[PDB]
Amino acid sequence: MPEEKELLELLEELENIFSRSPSDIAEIVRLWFFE
Amino acid sequence: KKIDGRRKAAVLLVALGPEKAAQVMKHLDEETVEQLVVEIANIGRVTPEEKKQVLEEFLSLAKAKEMISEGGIEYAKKVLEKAFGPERARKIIER
DSSP: OHHHHHHHHHHHHHHHHHHHOHHHHHHHHHHHHOO | OOOOHHHHHHHHHHHHOHHHHHHHHTTSOHHHHHHHHHHHHTOOOOOHHHHHHHHHHHHHHHHTTSOOOSOHHHHHHHHHHHHHOHHHHHHHSOO
16 A cells, blocks of 8 residues: 555556657557567 | 566556557557557456556656756655665765
8 A cells, every 4th residue: 555655656647648648658559569 | 577568568558547548549550459459458467566567667768758857856865765765765865
């Protein structure tokens, strides 16, 4: 639950990134999936 | 501990949840999406450590393009407390 607390922190940053640009997430998905 | 890049992408999209993952995937072509849905479909259980590792690497990569202007104190605080805990950190930087 302290560990859970830092998970929500990471998820909040992820959420923030999504609302700014889903295409920046797609770019990292691409990078990862093709090696 | 060492995660294949295909599984990393699948863990990230699962963590986003279906409505946000679907929006991300519209930025990818049809053939990429089909391979990703197959990786997602066979992802199985995601451990809490896998999830945290993927999220940490994702955030570092997403900020790579960003110009940094100060904020170093808060950054150093998080590094010190993750590395050593706050009580030891206080003594490292000198009482």
